[model samples]
Target: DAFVGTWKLVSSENFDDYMKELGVGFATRKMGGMAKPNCIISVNGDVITIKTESTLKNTEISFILGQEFDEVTADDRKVKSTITLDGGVLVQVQKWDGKSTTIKRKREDDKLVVECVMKGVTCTRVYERA
Candidate 1:
């Protein structure tokens, strides 16, 4: 798969608003916005894992497609998450506190582009293979 490698964050847009929609505190959002995380993706049979590392924090999760699992998000919220592949795009939906958000990750040319949407706010983060 195109995503099975290390990638470095190259750009982010409207991520603060996306964090705000998730009820992240101002200081935490500010810190999160400034941190450039490296994402490492790998797959073993039916299980896929994504590990995010940064100066502020690091998180790793492994899951199977279409199965709901408990997840602690980067902003420190516990949610139910389900990931599926749609036309080569990795789509993840998270639900918590009766609310939900959607994230789609796909390869755009030579870059890994991630789109996060909550309510009506959308944030796009671009990454390059490293």
Candidate 2:
């Protein structure tokens, strides 16, 4: 599909607030804002995998649509996760400690739009093909 490829982080907005909502620390949030992560996306039928890498951290996630599974965040929090694909967007819902985070990865023209919302904070990240 359109999302199956490698992408490079190009820009972001309000990411620090989003990180804070997730309880990310001051030092780490700063690192995250300065990061240029390579996001590799793989799609096979109903299964999708996204691998992210940067000098600060690296993590990979694999999930089947509509199926709940145990997942650990890049920052080490465990959560119940579920992924869904609708209209040109791939949405991820992660729940932990009565908190829920939703990430929507969508295709927009030649760029990938990654939007994350949690605790009323919304962060937007744009990625270009690498």
Candidate that would win on TM-score: 1
lDDT of 2: 0.91
TM of each candidate vs. truth: 0.98, 0.94
Runs in model 1 lying further than 4 Å from the true structure:
none
Error of 2 at 23 (Å): 1.1
Writing each residue's lDDT as its tens digit, candidate 1 over 1-130 gives 8889999999999999999988999999989999999999999999999999999999999999999999999888999999999999999999998999999999989999999999999999999988
Residue pairs with clashing backbones, model 2: none
- CA error at residue 38 for candidate 1, angstroms: 0.2
Kindly give the stretch of ten consecutive residues in candidate 2 with the minimal lDDT sum.
Answer: 82-91
Query: What local distance difference test score does each model get?
Result: 0.95, 0.91
Cα lDDT for residue 52, candidate 2: 98
Per-residue lDDT tens digits of candidate 2, residues 42-123? Answer: 9887778899999989999888888999988877899999888788688889999888999999999989999999877999
